[PDB]
Amino acid sequence: MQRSPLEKASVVSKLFFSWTRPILRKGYRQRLELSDIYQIPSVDSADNLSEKLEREWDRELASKKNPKLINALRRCFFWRFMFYGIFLYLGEVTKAVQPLLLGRIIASYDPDNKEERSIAIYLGIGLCLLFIVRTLLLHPAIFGLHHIGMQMRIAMFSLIYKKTLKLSSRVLDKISIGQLVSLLSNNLNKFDEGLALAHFVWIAPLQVALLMGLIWELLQASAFCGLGFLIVLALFQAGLGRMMMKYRDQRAGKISERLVITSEMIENIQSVKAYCWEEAMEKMIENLRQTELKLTRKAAYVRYFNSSAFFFSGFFVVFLSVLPYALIKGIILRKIFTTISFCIVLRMAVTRQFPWAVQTWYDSLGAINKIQDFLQKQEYKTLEYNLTTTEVVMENVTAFWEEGFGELFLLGTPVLKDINFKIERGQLLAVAGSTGAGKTSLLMVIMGELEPSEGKIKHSGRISFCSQFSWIMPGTIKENIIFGVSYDEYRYRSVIKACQLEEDISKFAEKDNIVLGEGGITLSGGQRARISLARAVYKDADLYLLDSPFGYLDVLTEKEIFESCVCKLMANKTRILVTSKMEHLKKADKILILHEGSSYFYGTFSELQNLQTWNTYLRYITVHKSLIFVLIWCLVIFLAEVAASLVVLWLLGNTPLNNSYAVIITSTSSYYVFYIYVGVADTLLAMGFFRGLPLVHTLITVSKILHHKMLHSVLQAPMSTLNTLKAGGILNRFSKDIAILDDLLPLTIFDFIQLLLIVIGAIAVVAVLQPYIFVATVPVIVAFIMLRAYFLQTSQQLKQLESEGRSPIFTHLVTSLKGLWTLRAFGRQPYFETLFHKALNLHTANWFLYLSTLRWFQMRIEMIFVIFFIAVTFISILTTGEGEGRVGIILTLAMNIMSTLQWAVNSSIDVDSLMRSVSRVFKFIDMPTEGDIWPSGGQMTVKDLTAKYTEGGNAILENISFSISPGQRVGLLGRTGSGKSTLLSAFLRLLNTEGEIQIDGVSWDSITLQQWRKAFGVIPQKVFIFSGTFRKNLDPYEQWSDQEIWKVADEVGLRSVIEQFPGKLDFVLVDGGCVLSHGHKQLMCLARSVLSKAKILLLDQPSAHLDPVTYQIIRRTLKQAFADCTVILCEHRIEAMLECQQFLVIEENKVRQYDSIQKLLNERSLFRQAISPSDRVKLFP
């Protein structure tokens, strides 16, 4: 890592921006190197900005009665804010005095021998010094203001991420990820570039006051008469401003809902492909856009007028100003043009520099209010008493989830009531019960996530927690198992052999460390559970909580890991466990059987028995045909007004001129009549509400069509290409990159087209009427194009490293919020905060570099304009004839046009920066694609089958072949990580395979893939429940009636489950269905499969954490409903083997098929010895 070149920098280097020069030379003729990126300055690192404002916010919370975040921001930024402001004021004031000096210098060309001839050369020296000081004075302050804005945003982001780790479990249901993603995604680039504009609130009025006097000097009465129009117009813009921020708060609710649905479906697409929910998910996301784009169009129409009140304003401000003076006194053409020159600055001042400033103050304070509101929320309180006898005691505890019923405490039943137990140190509790007893809830009360209404808890602060839903952070298996602490060879090895991952870890190529993705979908269910258990075991504490880690494990692994870890590695400490088997309750010492949130029994086991680039700019215009018709329509009207103005100026110039109306002489006429046109060519060549409206309308329609294709392509792309990319990378584009095509990109293109047409049409009319001005413009034209092409080589490459630099920030914010309970259990906030700071530093490193490279370009293009204007002014003034200097008449006219072009080139750079977004969208659109009555009996014939995830990697299954006769139930089994899911995924052909599986005498290649996947009926291992009503989850296509779904709901047994909630089959599930328990989610997938009547169906461990009572429902529904259809049942519990006839065993990357159970168990002795005594009397009579 190379240090920043800004650190070792001379005043001249920091003033002229010469320190950014290397990366341009490096980036021009080579692709950018990671080495070449510079480390951030020590001033704007994450930790200092966090520390600094964290310190002020605590002081703000301590002192005042009702604290405000702006007051905290004031005390650490205000002086450096206002310090640049006064330079930016003086830099803007020097624009207003430019017409005074240049005015006379134009006037000194007049043969009428005025006093100007005398003063011209001193104006000549002065006006050069005037430009030089402004170019120096402006740009350092803008970069200064951008640099302060970047520090403000990094400071606040750091405070949100600290706040979200201390946030309550009560609040997590209210705030989804879409709330947090949107808040960061809105501010990420808008807040930094805004603080340049923010000062013009108090610059613009003083500028208006300063300009109004200089005009008052020329026109005594009428200038006020003119100003009134701009007061009239400024109120109209403020009206549009308020209107446009009422359309943005309606839409802001909608965007959050779209991101949570988009995140959820892509996070677990493998299930979405199995069920065949492409049509369903696309139509759902389609309906959320409808409302969004309606509000986007309405907001965009009000935004156009706001950005179209400067171009039109021009003609009318001068006309109403000169007309009254003309009627009484008369006017000289010298006077009209000086007024023009003042007017342009005044509008700039009052119609794009005043409405852009206020609008920035609303958004910044609005964003700060949301952050301040977010910082003042209900916190997770901690109350740990290190003093103890290591006595985990609980007495008289009741607990409600929601606030209302708990606070009012007969609204509903509390999940716990009248519980009490005593636990000495060196003994395990067996927490037993049916699905929805409150076993997870009990552990949540022990940790302190769920707060009890009446009762008391006390243990020491040190605690470990193995959750029911396993959580894998991004990184290596080592980084997962140790989890933000030092490494211990003796400890770590002894844990992995106890948990027995030595088998599973040795099969990987990179033995110890393989980089797992967000969630760890590279691993199977069994491998995640044991990693979560290894993380729990490797951690050292007084109390170990274990929320049923033996759900996805087979009986052999389950017994060995129980008799190898729970009773061996830790057997001198309190360790409450969740389980439902006799073998575990025998060795256990204290047993607690919960039922309907009530203690059915409490005691011991013995007692219980006793008891009972060109291509990017071209593929974005040829998505939608309307856009190319509108642009041609604009151009033909543009040609007409260019044509209209030309014959106006033909008649005007060719005039043969009592007529006080307007004084002209042969001399003055020739070199003022043209300049008056150039200053009034901003309105004449303006886009109206006939051209500008449809252009904005179509550009939003392009972003509607692009998003449809993008979401469409991501859904039906193959599995390898979706495992390759991250969660935050997907979520970054649909959040930020699609929001740029809707909001900023439509109106930036309008200003680039508007300014480009003005310059083209200005040069066109001036050139055709007077030839040499085209030749005079050409050397300045080539200078801008030359420098632009040179800059974009570096700029496009920085804008991609920075844009893709955002994915680290989001990816980390997902896992942080996803596995929040484990973070506070272990107490690893200091790790994740410092790990989050690295993401901000990475983004800052790239963003700061891009930002600094831009002002180089912004300064150089102004310097080029200054260098030429200096040359033009002395050539003009020195080569002035004794009468009628024509050299300056030709040259300065060009240099008046180049001011408008300079502004257009700056707009052109803003378009290209926003157009990369569309570039990165098109990468996702251009991804590869996975690509009588038919399933009558459902007999399958496999031959020469092979299964692997990566292309040309390791074969998981090799030369598999077997046969199932029609309407026969088949058992599937093996050791955890055998490949059982891979065999189920091979039928759906989600991963790439070779061979053929022919069904009912017909093969794969004979039919399409989607028509193929509708034959099967799937219950996947990982459950997927998106945000919506129960009826939406049970059938998205809404084929089945309520009578139908209620008819299914009784057999699988969600009768008592649904009726608990207020809206029966209308209750909106949130946070991926956190309201339901783990058992009900298995029943949810069961009902989902029962509805889908399929003559073949595949069950990937239907019973995961179901007790023997709940499992009767599975076999009841499996015997009754699934009558004639063939069943492949992948299950670990041996009770399920009584149902099905044929068995498929998986080992050594190959299969074995068996008819009877006796033969199969006979050859494997350790697996036969693992069978429970209660399940041993069933198999063998």
Ligand SMILES: Nc1ncnc2c1ncn2[C@@H]1O[C@H](COP(=O)(O)OP(=O)(O)OP(=O)(O)O)[C@@H](O)[C@H]1O
């Ligand atoms: N966040 C929540 N909000 C509202 N109700 C909840 C929430 N979490 C759990 N419940 C309800 O509390 C009851 C008990 O929940 P809990 O998850 O502790 O049961 P469990 O014994 O862990 O289930 P399983 O045996 O299937 O793992 C369930 O009926 C469930 O609907």
Ligand SMILES: Nc1ncnc2c1ncn2[C@@H]1O[C@H](COP(=O)(O)OP(=O)(O)OP(=O)(O)O)[C@@H](O)[C@H]1O
């Ligand atoms: N998407 C994937 N990419 C790469 N390798 C994978 C992927 N999924 C699984 N594997 C590897 O293949 C092995 C077996 O796959 P599979 O997921 O079918 O096991 P499983 O039978 O589902 O496990 P369990 O018995 O715990 O349910 C895993 O141990 C894992 O290392």
Ligand SMILES: CC(C)CCC[C@@H](C)[C@H]1CC[C@H]2[C@@H]3CC=C4C[C@@H](O)CC[C@]4(C)[C@H]3CC[C@]12C
């Ligand atoms: C400091 C600012 C806010 C003061 C108000 C604006 C400035 C531009 C105003 C205030 C006083 C004004 C001056 C008042 C009187 C005269 C004399 C007149 O024959 C020429 C113009 C001139 C010289 C004015 C120029 C503009 C002026 C300097």
Ligand SMILES: [Mg+2]
């Ligand atoms: Mg549970």
Ligand SMILES: [Mg+2]
């Ligand atoms: Mg499996």
